[PDB]
Amino acid sequence: TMIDINVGGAIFETSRHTLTQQKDSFIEKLHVTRDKQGRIFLDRDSELFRIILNFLRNPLTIPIPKDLSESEALLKEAEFYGIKFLPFPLVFCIGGFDGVEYLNSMELLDISQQCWRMCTPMSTKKAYFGSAVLNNFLYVFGGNNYDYKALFETEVYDRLRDVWYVSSNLNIPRRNNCGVTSNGRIYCIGGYDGSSIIPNVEAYDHRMKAWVEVAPLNTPRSSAMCVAFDNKIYVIGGTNGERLNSIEVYEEKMNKWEQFPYALLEARSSGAAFNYLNQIYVVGGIDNEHNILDSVEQYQPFNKRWQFLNGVPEKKMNFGAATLSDSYIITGGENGEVLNSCHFFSPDTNEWQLGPSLLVPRFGHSVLIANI
Amino acid sequence: MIDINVGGAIFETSRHTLTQQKDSFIEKLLSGRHHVTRDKQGRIFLDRDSELFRIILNFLRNPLTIPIPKDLSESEALLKEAEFYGIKFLPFPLVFCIGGFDGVEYLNSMELLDISQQCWRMCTPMSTKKAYFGSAVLNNFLYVFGGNNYDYKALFETEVYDRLRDVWYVSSNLNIPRRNNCGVTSNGRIYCIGGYDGSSIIPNVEAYDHRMKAWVEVAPLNTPRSSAMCVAFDNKIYVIGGTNGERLNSIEVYEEKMNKWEQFPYALLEARSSGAAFNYLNQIYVVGGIDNEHNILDSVEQYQPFNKRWQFLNGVPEKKMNFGAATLSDSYIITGGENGEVLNSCHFFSNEWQLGPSLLVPRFGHSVLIANI
């Protein structure tokens, strides 16, 4: 059957099938407001709707925005309508160090082909940088290479236009800083400014289009792990001369860091932390006896203590990692040797499934997930 | 955290994991919208293969990693099983472009349309290079049968592509070798219709039965055709147009229940071969080709059974014949072909025509096949 819709004065003729192929989207859900001639009416931008409708008419073909603004405009619009351009996540592996060279190369996990393919490189070669996703653009910031002990540059990846661009500079150049997204902002936490280990924390606001400094950590930390959920930011472990087992909590709403009452069982840096439901996880890294770890710690809010789980199949530090909808993926790292190995963790079993291997073995790199 | 009982084996998991695919049969089960059977210990119970479920459950826990079957048997067993649960291993269709002729060489190469990168990528080639072969999908395996190259005017060989295992293998031989034969799947069998046997234009029709593992001959066409166009819907098979020396405009309908081809009362007014036919809802569509006045066509004809007549619609953005083409959900894809030059262009049809990405290797006499695993 065939629906007419009025979007911002423009009329679009389509079928019920086309507009509701995506369950629970806003357009599918839509007494509604109608125009004089009876048609469903949306006071939204017609041209953006047009592009989205052509996408829905053939979902094998992804829109190509004409510039940065329409690209940002389109993703925002699609989010309002509840539309996804791809029914699977895009898993990216960025930068790092290969053993002798710093890298600007990027790898994308090809679900169809069940392997990693080389993808679009960023402009600056670097390892050990903060990274995060904001409105499904990829952000990388800080880091170091052969020309600089610490960097202030921020690069941003626009997938739909397939291009990297240069964004705002960090106030304090640093490496081994932690990046996390919390409530519409990117936070840049701790690290090493080139001469000392710092407590400083910066926030990126996209309306401001700028990095601004916010409340610092109570303890300087480099190579800490961070994770954000439930309007809080957790910074875990890291090193200031000794590896730490302490944890600081940022109440986003109060711009205040408090000490977290429950330390790690194993003090560590250069690992990774993540979140599933109410629970926090910590994986890999290196301890204060300089041992590279495979151990995993889960924090159970019910019991208010950290407990170990089964470890990762192989020990590693300075890997790239990120959570997906079902899983947690881990890529590369170092452990005596430079690694290309990848594993998925399921909170359904707390076990680790082997994944496809990176084309270029690397550490000090990042993993980011785009859900466009 | 749910416990489920499959073939006596117990699996501990979550509702989240088992309901990720909306409206799958297993989601309907674990969401209370369909009668469930339970065991004494209370758990949901499924009288099915335990090992196949294990493989599927591991898939569901990480849908970025696709199961690799250990052999042909399990590969078929798994797809059949996933189909029962209503589960797909990929959330998009796999669109393949196979074989053909590039202008100078016959091809065994196959291209896969990469949705992520929005381009065509080279895939696993079949073992024999050929153009003008019949093709079809059956239980999400790709089949190719017949064809020709510089060494053979016609073929009886059938190759089959298994995507989960990423391998081609040989199947049963055709009874009558052909090139310029037409392929269709109807009620569990692949049909091989018409063509050129190496010596003449023939009317013969063979059906492949997967249980018997044999091509078995059935009722022939009333009129020999090579390069005809075919389609199956409403439990019937329609063969349209083609050539026997001159292009034809006649159309034959096959009733399986009577093993008989009848003439279709509404012929094309305009005769053609080397095109394509397809189905959307109740209507028959016919696209491109070449007429008896030797014009390479871009026209599209729709048959509306309600009004009992053929009508033209919006054409293909360009004229082409001997292209590969296939239907997706809501859409229709058309790739390559010839119009003086060998083409690599692609287009999607709904009632408009959208431009697509272009093939790596321009080709005609090839097929397009779609796997939905």
XYZ file of C-alpha atoms in Angstrom:
745
model
C 0.000 0.000 0.000
C 1.059 3.571 -0.787
C 1.505 6.504 1.641
C 1.906 10.201 0.880
C 3.967 12.263 3.281
C 4.416 16.030 3.612
C 7.856 16.903 4.970
C 8.489 20.619 5.262
C 6.081 21.491 2.453
C 7.545 18.861 0.139
C 5.458 15.873 -0.913
C 6.927 12.349 -1.093
C 5.130 9.371 -2.605
C 6.169 6.012 -1.192
C 4.969 2.710 0.324
C 4.262 1.705 3.931
C 6.898 -1.016 3.507
C 9.654 1.473 2.723
C 9.127 3.785 5.703
C 8.667 1.029 8.292
C 11.368 -1.499 7.325
C 13.215 -0.371 10.495
C 11.312 -1.411 13.625
C 10.759 1.232 16.331
C 12.046 4.090 14.187
C 10.185 7.376 14.584
C 8.868 7.264 11.039
C 7.518 3.792 11.493
C 5.729 4.710 14.759
C 4.049 7.711 13.100
C -3.735 11.168 16.191
C -0.834 12.607 14.173
C -0.530 16.109 12.722
C -1.647 16.460 9.080
C -1.804 19.152 6.416
C -4.946 20.612 4.805
C -5.001 17.932 2.124
C -4.882 15.177 4.775
C -1.268 13.980 4.399
C 0.956 13.132 7.380
C 3.021 16.238 8.059
C 6.515 16.692 9.482
C 8.007 20.117 10.027
C 11.507 18.962 9.113
C 14.036 19.721 6.374
C 12.706 18.359 3.065
C 16.048 17.856 1.324
C 17.441 15.815 4.223
C 14.258 13.755 4.187
C 14.654 13.263 0.449
C 18.145 11.838 0.873
C 16.987 9.561 3.660
C 14.005 8.372 1.607
C 16.222 7.434 -1.358
C 18.349 5.497 1.090
C 15.261 3.649 2.368
C 14.169 2.887 -1.242
C 17.497 1.046 -1.711
C 19.353 0.347 1.549
C 22.291 -1.197 -0.328
C 23.268 2.323 -1.278
C 24.591 4.693 1.410
C 24.204 8.465 0.990
C 27.242 10.564 0.055
C 26.916 13.976 1.732
C 28.123 16.837 -0.375
C 30.145 18.420 2.523
C 30.953 18.319 6.276
C 27.839 20.241 7.276
C 25.294 18.090 5.362
C 27.158 15.055 6.677
C 26.679 16.232 10.263
C 23.135 17.357 9.400
C 22.267 14.006 7.819
C 23.417 11.801 10.721
C 21.565 14.085 13.175
C 18.393 13.898 11.049
C 18.595 10.117 10.694
C 18.998 9.799 14.470
C 15.815 11.806 14.918
C 13.952 9.541 12.506
C 15.516 6.507 14.142
C 17.190 5.402 10.931
C 20.434 3.474 10.665
C 22.330 3.464 7.359
C 24.013 0.105 8.135
C 22.509 -2.905 10.021
C 25.954 -3.779 11.445
C 28.712 -1.907 13.355
C 31.819 -0.543 11.664
C 34.868 -1.624 13.678
C 37.959 0.518 13.156
C 41.578 -0.059 14.229
C 43.677 3.099 14.171
C 47.340 4.063 14.299
C 49.855 2.676 16.741
C 53.393 1.406 16.460
C 54.525 -1.615 14.414
C 57.876 -2.314 16.076
C 59.928 0.320 14.250
C 57.456 2.722 12.566
C 54.620 4.871 13.957
C 51.402 4.307 11.955
C 48.672 6.427 10.398
C 47.031 3.409 8.744
C 43.532 2.251 9.620
C 41.813 -1.143 9.445
C 38.117 -1.894 9.119
C 36.629 -5.269 10.040
C 34.790 -6.591 6.965
C 31.884 -8.671 8.298
C 30.965 -9.958 4.854
C 34.516 -11.118 4.110
C 35.242 -12.107 7.772
C 38.631 -10.402 7.730
C 40.241 -7.001 8.276
C 40.722 -4.779 5.202
C 43.047 -1.788 4.950
C 41.053 1.420 5.039
C 41.496 5.218 4.834
C 44.601 6.422 6.689
C 44.601 9.460 8.956
C 47.029 12.311 8.272
C 49.401 11.995 11.258
C 51.365 8.889 12.298
C 51.054 8.241 16.053
C 50.726 5.787 18.921
C 49.387 6.228 22.481
C 46.603 8.781 21.874
C 43.191 9.376 23.401
C 40.256 8.310 21.226
C 36.453 8.400 21.298
C 33.319 8.517 19.222
C 30.940 11.494 19.160
C 27.859 11.570 16.882
C 29.434 8.618 14.999
C 32.471 10.602 13.935
C 35.806 9.165 15.075
C 38.054 11.331 17.248
C 41.772 10.826 17.950
C 43.825 13.326 20.003
C 47.246 13.566 21.626
C 49.805 10.809 21.202
C 53.443 10.804 20.131
C 55.630 9.936 17.117
C 59.213 10.406 15.874
C 58.823 14.164 15.588
C 57.015 14.849 18.882
C 57.108 13.462 22.452
C 53.541 14.742 22.885
C 50.915 16.099 20.509
C 47.967 18.468 20.727
C 46.424 17.644 17.312
C 42.897 16.217 16.995
C 41.793 14.345 13.865
C 38.181 13.436 12.978
C 36.930 10.695 10.658
C 33.798 11.266 8.618
C 32.803 7.827 7.249
C 29.974 8.913 4.949
C 32.304 11.281 3.074
C 35.211 8.926 3.858
C 37.582 11.686 4.872
C 39.730 12.710 7.830
C 39.811 16.351 8.910
C 41.751 18.407 11.406
C 39.770 19.580 14.398
C 40.601 21.512 17.607
C 43.940 21.457 19.406
C 44.346 20.086 22.901
C 45.286 22.730 25.447
C 47.957 20.417 26.874
C 49.791 18.150 24.433
C 50.132 14.729 25.964
C 50.467 11.006 25.295
C 48.983 8.017 27.089
C 45.893 10.107 27.750
C 42.486 8.429 28.100
C 39.536 9.407 25.909
C 35.899 8.755 26.668
C 32.487 10.027 25.575
C 30.086 11.179 28.291
C 26.759 12.939 27.747
C 27.514 14.643 24.453
C 31.135 15.518 25.300
C 34.541 13.918 24.765
C 36.840 13.842 27.822
C 40.648 13.763 27.573
C 42.128 12.419 30.788
C 45.601 12.312 32.288
C 48.636 11.169 30.383
C 52.173 12.445 29.974
C 52.885 15.973 28.744
C 56.381 15.156 27.556
C 58.238 15.732 30.825
C 55.814 14.820 33.624
C 52.743 12.766 34.471
C 49.728 15.058 34.638
C 46.268 15.112 36.323
C 44.716 17.483 33.787
C 41.398 16.758 32.107
C 39.949 18.418 28.978
C 36.459 18.344 27.484
C 35.530 18.721 23.811
C 32.108 20.392 23.177
C 30.912 20.281 19.561
C 28.762 23.423 19.837
C 31.874 25.171 21.162
C 34.047 23.390 18.629
C 36.857 23.587 21.149
C 38.740 21.763 23.867
C 38.222 23.347 27.296
C 39.890 22.358 30.570
C 37.687 21.012 33.398
C 38.260 19.678 36.923
C 41.556 17.719 37.180
C 41.996 14.241 38.668
C 43.017 14.095 42.347
C 46.047 11.895 41.406
C 48.154 12.361 38.270
C 47.832 9.333 35.979
C 49.330 8.085 32.767
C 48.064 5.043 30.775
C 44.947 4.812 32.959
C 41.698 3.209 31.833
C 38.411 5.034 31.551
C 34.826 4.132 31.004
C 31.654 6.186 31.088
C 28.124 5.113 31.955
C 25.178 6.238 34.164
C 26.301 9.904 33.980
C 29.687 9.104 35.578
C 33.288 8.779 34.383
C 35.545 6.120 35.939
C 39.310 6.470 35.602
C 40.978 3.240 36.677
C 44.599 2.412 37.388
C 47.398 3.923 35.390
C 50.873 4.792 36.588
C 52.419 7.854 38.202
C 55.731 6.180 38.979
C 54.044 3.156 40.418
C 51.121 1.382 38.841
C 47.948 2.291 40.747
C 44.928 0.335 41.886
C 42.945 3.455 42.769
C 39.857 4.671 40.944
C 38.373 8.155 40.533
C 34.782 8.975 39.659
C 33.659 12.039 37.756
C 30.105 13.095 38.402
C 29.557 14.733 35.047
C 26.671 16.753 36.531
C 28.782 18.240 39.351
C 32.183 18.768 37.670
C 33.781 17.039 40.683
C 36.076 13.962 40.918
C 35.611 11.797 44.015
C 37.677 8.824 45.113
C 36.038 5.468 44.315
C 35.870 3.287 47.480
C 36.835 -0.076 45.892
C 40.355 -0.472 44.497
C 41.574 -3.055 41.966
C 42.832 -6.440 43.079
C 45.821 -6.031 40.730
C 47.316 -2.538 40.321
C 47.941 -1.868 36.629
C 48.448 0.405 33.677
C 48.135 0.033 29.879
C 45.121 -2.290 30.073
C 41.500 -1.510 29.237
C 38.208 -1.035 30.990
C 34.681 -1.423 29.820
C 31.067 -1.492 30.840
C 28.133 -3.907 30.379
C 24.855 -3.114 32.160
C 25.877 -1.988 35.663
C 29.185 -3.852 35.675
C 32.748 -2.627 35.065
C 35.498 -4.802 33.560
C 39.288 -4.411 33.517
C 41.523 -6.460 31.168
C 45.246 -6.989 30.546
C 47.974 -4.411 31.027
C 51.073 -4.540 33.220
C 51.532 -4.715 37.015
C 53.933 -3.036 39.378
C 56.387 -5.967 39.042
C 56.485 -5.220 35.285
C 54.509 -8.367 34.456
C 52.265 -8.205 31.409
C 48.821 -9.352 32.471
C 46.060 -11.513 31.043
C 43.875 -11.135 34.110
C 40.347 -9.746 34.089
C 38.550 -8.070 36.978
C 34.811 -7.519 37.187
C 33.180 -5.080 39.627
C 29.862 -6.357 40.969
C 27.738 -3.544 42.417
C 25.602 -6.167 44.198
C 28.602 -7.355 46.245
C 30.525 -4.062 46.109
C 33.938 -5.655 45.462
C 36.216 -6.548 42.548
C 36.498 -10.252 41.623
C 38.594 -12.047 38.983
C 37.119 -13.814 35.940
C 38.825 -16.140 33.468
C 41.733 -14.338 31.792
C 42.360 -13.367 28.185
C 43.736 -16.238 26.057
C 46.954 -14.337 25.737
C 48.530 -11.565 27.841
C 48.861 -8.116 26.350
C 49.326 -4.419 27.096
C 48.755 -1.370 24.847
C 46.078 -3.008 22.755
C 43.077 -1.323 21.097
C 39.652 -2.251 22.427
C 35.949 -1.281 22.417
C 32.509 -2.595 23.331
C 29.933 -3.660 20.723
C 26.224 -4.372 21.222
C 26.790 -8.003 22.156
C 30.485 -8.121 22.839
C 33.805 -6.602 23.665
C 36.618 -6.737 21.103
C 40.371 -6.623 21.778
C 42.973 -6.123 19.080
C 46.764 -6.355 18.922
C 49.040 -5.162 21.700
C 52.488 -6.184 22.878
C 53.760 -8.877 25.253
C 57.419 -9.407 24.429
C 56.282 -9.723 20.811
C 54.229 -7.255 18.698
C 50.717 -8.755 18.314
C 48.015 -8.971 15.633
C 45.677 -11.235 17.580
C 42.011 -10.383 18.243
C 39.452 -11.819 20.651
C 35.820 -11.238 21.523
C 34.459 -11.438 25.062
C 30.878 -12.392 25.793
C 29.293 -11.236 29.066
C 26.981 -14.176 28.453
C 29.751 -16.654 29.235
C 32.656 -14.521 30.358
C 34.777 -16.398 27.838
C 36.987 -15.300 24.974
C 36.363 -16.266 21.342
C 39.212 -15.967 18.839
C 38.717 -13.361 16.107
C 40.326 -12.473 12.756
C 43.864 -11.067 12.847
C 44.968 -7.543 12.015
C 46.751 -7.119 8.720
C 49.434 -5.031 10.389
C 50.455 -6.218 13.861
C 50.539 -3.143 16.108
C 50.367 -1.715 19.610
C 49.649 1.716 21.094
C 46.755 1.861 18.610
C 43.030 2.347 19.204
C 39.746 0.659 18.295
C 36.560 2.723 17.603
C 33.046 1.625 16.587
C 30.833 3.599 14.243
C 27.088 2.865 14.282
C 25.833 4.887 11.317
C 19.163 -15.317 32.269
C 17.202 -18.048 30.440
C 17.700 -21.827 30.387
C 16.576 -23.488 27.115
C 16.267 -27.206 26.326
C 17.334 -28.169 22.807
C 17.446 -31.893 22.015
C 17.974 -32.713 25.681
C 20.966 -30.406 25.918
C 20.655 -27.387 28.202
C 21.931 -23.953 27.220
C 22.164 -21.096 29.706
C 21.848 -17.704 28.041
C 19.762 -14.523 28.006
C 16.518 -13.345 26.354
C 18.561 -10.504 24.857
C 20.726 -12.980 22.933
C 17.843 -15.116 21.669
C 15.656 -12.192 20.560
C 18.186 -9.999 18.665
C 16.419 -10.753 15.388
C 12.937 -9.261 15.531
C 10.174 -11.517 14.214
C 12.478 -14.505 13.922
C 10.660 -17.673 14.989
C 12.867 -18.039 18.031
C 12.260 -14.447 19.130
C 8.499 -15.054 18.824
C 9.085 -18.003 21.158
C 11.104 -16.157 23.816
C 8.723 -13.193 23.842
C 5.422 -14.937 24.500
C 3.809 -14.372 21.122
C 3.870 -18.041 20.121
C 2.920 -21.337 21.818
C 5.929 -22.837 23.557
C 6.411 -26.447 24.748
C 8.237 -26.930 28.059
C 9.961 -29.760 29.901
C 9.260 -31.028 33.426
C 11.982 -28.819 34.859
C 10.069 -25.876 33.364
C 12.461 -24.815 30.599
C 11.475 -24.084 26.998
C 12.013 -27.240 24.906
C 12.978 -27.697 21.265
C 13.194 -31.158 19.760
C 16.046 -30.293 17.405
C 19.721 -30.927 16.818
C 21.754 -29.822 19.811
C 25.065 -29.273 18.028
C 23.493 -27.082 15.331
C 21.896 -24.991 18.081
C 25.257 -24.658 19.848
C 26.827 -23.301 16.661
C 23.928 -20.866 16.208
C 24.006 -19.678 19.813
C 27.704 -18.876 19.511
C 26.829 -16.894 16.420
C 24.132 -14.943 18.268
C 26.537 -14.057 21.103
C 28.801 -12.437 18.480
C 26.994 -11.775 15.142
C 30.197 -10.227 13.741
C 31.649 -13.718 13.523
C 30.029 -16.073 11.048
C 30.144 -19.840 11.644
C 32.291 -21.919 9.304
C 30.774 -25.350 8.654
C 33.177 -28.303 8.732
C 31.722 -29.828 5.557
C 29.036 -29.730 2.852
C 26.673 -31.806 4.990
C 26.791 -29.575 8.069
C 26.737 -26.480 5.848
C 23.398 -27.535 4.416
C 22.213 -28.801 7.806
C 23.015 -25.438 9.462
C 21.324 -23.198 6.886
C 18.201 -25.378 7.001
C 18.288 -25.173 10.806
C 18.851 -21.377 10.852
C 15.926 -21.074 8.474
C 13.717 -22.915 10.983
C 14.673 -20.545 13.808
C 14.192 -17.637 11.386
C 17.802 -16.535 11.832
C 20.034 -14.834 9.279
C 23.825 -14.905 9.528
C 24.148 -11.565 7.678
C 21.772 -8.601 8.046
C 22.103 -7.773 4.322
C 21.861 -9.764 1.068
C 24.987 -11.028 -0.693
C 24.854 -9.855 -4.297
C 27.103 -11.846 -6.630
C 28.128 -11.154 -10.221
C 29.356 -14.314 -11.978
C 31.203 -15.144 -15.179
C 30.404 -13.797 -18.620
C 32.496 -12.242 -21.374
C 34.597 -9.081 -20.912
C 35.105 -8.165 -24.552
C 38.078 -10.475 -25.195
C 38.078 -13.265 -22.564
C 35.399 -15.564 -21.146
C 35.316 -15.320 -17.359
C 35.266 -17.506 -14.272
C 35.604 -14.472 -11.944
C 32.899 -13.487 -9.506
C 32.380 -10.097 -7.919
C 30.715 -9.420 -4.607
C 29.021 -6.095 -3.872
C 30.508 -4.711 -0.680
C 27.798 -2.778 1.213
C 30.299 -1.387 3.792
C 32.750 -0.002 1.188
C 29.972 0.716 -1.341
C 31.836 -0.969 -4.182
C 32.300 -4.297 -5.981
C 35.092 -6.594 -4.745
C 36.617 -9.649 -6.431
C 35.491 -12.901 -4.829
C 36.137 -16.621 -5.176
C 36.174 -17.601 -8.886
C 34.363 -20.699 -10.192
C 36.486 -23.431 -11.825
C 35.281 -23.023 -15.434
C 35.233 -19.770 -17.431
C 31.971 -19.362 -19.376
C 29.340 -16.936 -20.597
C 25.667 -17.535 -21.311
C 24.918 -20.165 -18.700
C 21.744 -20.754 -16.724
C 21.790 -19.784 -13.048
C 19.716 -20.015 -9.904
C 19.798 -20.063 -6.106
C 18.469 -23.019 -4.132
C 18.615 -23.005 -0.308
C 21.154 -20.167 -0.608
C 23.660 -22.099 -2.647
C 24.537 -20.609 -6.072
C 24.123 -22.869 -9.133
C 25.523 -22.383 -12.616
C 24.867 -24.806 -15.469
C 25.585 -24.841 -19.218
C 27.377 -22.089 -21.112
C 30.225 -21.668 -23.554
C 33.796 -20.433 -24.021
C 36.410 -20.418 -26.837
C 36.747 -24.206 -26.442
C 33.087 -25.224 -26.106
C 29.952 -24.129 -27.918
C 27.829 -25.624 -25.114
C 28.290 -27.260 -21.671
C 26.576 -29.785 -19.385
C 28.711 -29.006 -16.308
C 27.086 -27.641 -13.128
C 29.075 -25.775 -10.437
C 27.768 -24.884 -6.994
C 28.949 -22.145 -4.622
C 28.788 -22.638 -0.834
C 29.345 -19.190 0.787
C 29.682 -20.277 4.441
C 32.583 -22.545 3.398
C 33.633 -20.171 0.562
C 34.072 -23.059 -1.896
C 32.869 -24.120 -5.367
C 32.146 -27.723 -6.188
C 30.832 -29.703 -9.187
C 27.326 -31.189 -9.189
C 25.238 -33.346 -11.539
C 25.641 -33.080 -15.304
C 22.903 -31.704 -17.552
C 21.349 -34.359 -19.820
C 21.445 -31.920 -22.702
C 24.393 -29.493 -22.834
C 23.440 -25.850 -23.574
C 24.478 -22.286 -23.813
C 21.948 -19.423 -23.837
C 19.700 -21.449 -21.558
C 17.542 -19.812 -18.858
C 17.514 -20.783 -15.143
C 14.762 -20.555 -12.451
C 13.951 -21.974 -9.026
C 10.373 -23.206 -8.535
C 8.931 -25.315 -5.704
C 12.248 -26.705 -4.557
C 13.711 -27.408 -7.978
C 15.973 -25.503 -10.334
C 14.744 -25.413 -13.927
C 16.964 -25.282 -16.990
C 15.068 -23.939 -19.971
C 15.868 -23.825 -23.668
C 19.074 -22.560 -25.220
C 21.490 -23.894 -27.820
C 22.941 -27.427 -27.433
C 26.019 -26.789 -29.572
C 24.213 -27.736 -32.781
C 20.635 -26.401 -32.697
C 18.160 -24.230 -30.827
C 16.216 -26.566 -28.538
C 12.927 -26.664 -26.560
C 14.146 -29.049 -23.831
C 13.642 -28.427 -20.130
C 15.433 -30.137 -17.189
C 14.791 -29.852 -13.465
C 17.391 -30.398 -10.752
C 16.162 -32.300 -7.723
C 18.352 -31.922 -4.689
C 17.167 -35.080 -2.945
C 17.783 -37.288 -6.002
C 20.967 -35.385 -6.939
C 20.057 -35.491 -10.607
C 18.884 -33.389 -13.481
C 15.707 -35.062 -14.699
C 14.057 -34.124 -17.976
C 10.486 -32.792 -18.069
C 7.978 -31.339 -20.531
C 9.693 -29.316 -23.287
C 8.686 -25.878 -24.530
C 6.285 -25.873 -27.479
C 8.734 -23.569 -29.250
C 12.550 -23.822 -29.243
C 14.143 -20.661 -27.837
C 17.659 -19.564 -27.076
C 18.231 -16.381 -24.943
C 14.673 -16.419 -23.608
C 13.679 -14.716 -20.337
C 12.094 -16.577 -17.448
C 10.456 -16.053 -14.083
C 8.468 -18.066 -11.526
C 5.617 -16.844 -9.307
C 2.167 -17.989 -8.124
C 3.398 -21.601 -8.365
C 3.945 -21.162 -12.118
C 6.914 -20.659 -14.450
C 6.800 -18.149 -17.275
C 9.158 -18.286 -20.245
C 9.132 -15.137 -22.366
C 10.580 -14.126 -25.716
C 13.895 -15.485 -26.908
C 15.051 -16.354 -30.403
C 14.971 -19.345 -32.746
C 16.216 -17.448 -35.799
C 13.933 -14.473 -35.310
C 13.100 -12.867 -31.958
C 9.845 -14.175 -30.414
C 7.044 -12.441 -28.531
C 5.318 -15.612 -27.310
C 5.121 -16.583 -23.651
C 4.731 -20.025 -22.093
C 3.453 -20.891 -18.626
C 4.413 -24.113 -16.872
C 1.950 -25.894 -14.596
C 4.077 -28.261 -12.495
C 1.034 -30.251 -11.362
C 0.343 -31.378 -14.929
C 3.889 -31.315 -16.404
C 2.497 -29.213 -19.256
C 3.438 -25.906 -20.898
C 0.469 -23.795 -22.026
C 0.607 -20.708 -24.273
C 0.021 -17.418 -22.437
C -2.994 -15.535 -23.918
C -1.319 -12.124 -23.650
C 1.773 -12.200 -25.787
C 4.165 -9.326 -25.967
C 3.205 -7.079 -28.856
C 6.902 -6.357 -29.253
C 9.202 -9.373 -29.696
C 12.549 -9.605 -27.887
C 15.429 -11.770 -26.689
C 18.553 -11.252 -24.550
C 16.695 -9.353 -21.818
C 15.453 -10.301 -18.342
C 12.139 -10.973 -16.634
C 11.210 -10.561 -12.957
C 8.395 -10.477 -10.417
C 7.153 -7.917 -7.858
C 3.885 -8.650 -6.067
C 1.430 -9.841 -8.745
C 2.981 -8.211 -11.833
C 5.412 -9.460 -14.511
C 8.134 -7.127 -15.716
C 10.363 -7.380 -18.770
C 13.532 -5.373 -19.270
C 16.009 -4.540 -22.061
C 17.212 -6.890 -24.816
C 17.064 -6.673 -28.620
C 14.146 -6.596 -31.099
C 13.599 -8.124 -34.555
C 14.509 -4.764 -36.040
C 17.886 -5.288 -34.260
C 17.546 -2.381 -31.788
C 19.255 -2.824 -28.438
C 16.470 -1.876 -26.010
C 16.049 0.096 -22.779
C 12.297 -0.376 -22.523
C 10.507 -1.930 -19.571
C 7.103 -3.606 -19.871
C 4.814 -4.406 -16.961
C 1.969 -6.846 -17.226
C -1.029 -5.876 -15.095
C -3.209 -8.989 -14.685
C -6.065 -6.933 -13.217
C -6.526 -4.984 -16.467
C -5.244 -7.883 -18.622
C -2.682 -5.886 -20.625
C 1.031 -5.076 -21.032
C 2.177 -1.484 -20.402
C 5.546 0.272 -20.720
C 7.150 2.012 -17.669
C 10.263 4.098 -17.078
C 13.159 2.659 -19.028
C 16.648 1.603 -18.030
C 18.841 4.688 -17.933
C 20.765 3.113 -20.780
C 20.138 0.480 -23.473
C 21.744 -2.902 -22.853
C 21.331 -6.574 -23.615
C 22.779 -9.746 -22.066
C 23.209 -8.209 -18.621
C 23.037 -9.932 -15.258
C 20.012 -9.075 -13.125
C 18.206 -10.160 -9.949
C 15.542 -9.084 -7.481
C 16.205 -7.853 -3.938
C 13.541 -7.042 -1.363
C 11.667 -3.976 -2.661
C 14.262 -3.555 -5.465
C 15.703 -5.015 -8.683
C 19.346 -4.886 -9.623
C 20.812 -4.867 -13.124
C 24.559 -5.071 -13.865
C 26.756 -4.860 -16.988
C 25.595 -6.035 -20.416
C 26.385 -4.816 -23.916
C 25.247 -1.972 -26.191
C 28.071 -1.830 -28.674
C 30.530 -1.448 -25.862
C 30.963 -3.887 -23.026
C 29.336 -2.290 -19.943
C 30.181 -2.240 -16.202
C 27.293 0.000 -15.109
C 24.750 -0.963 -12.444
C 21.246 0.276 -11.659
C 18.495 -0.276 -9.082
C 14.799 -0.215 -9.952
C 11.790 0.225 -7.651
C 8.953 3.293 -10.003
C 12.384 4.837 -10.555
C 15.961 3.906 -11.585
C 18.863 4.705 -9.252
C 22.502 4.532 -10.329
C 24.664 1.858 -8.649
C 28.406 1.228 -8.187
C 30.237 -0.072 -11.239
C 31.726 -3.545 -11.744
C 35.464 -3.987 -11.514
C 35.432 -5.967 -14.752
C 33.000 -4.895 -17.493
C 31.131 -7.939 -18.727
C 28.095 -9.371 -20.491
C 26.628 -12.895 -20.720
C 27.103 -13.105 -16.964
C 24.623 -13.768 -14.171
C 23.728 -11.962 -10.947
C 22.746 -14.184 -7.996
C 21.673 -13.318 -4.494
C 22.348 -15.273 -1.317
C 20.372 -14.464 1.857
C 22.197 -16.475 4.535
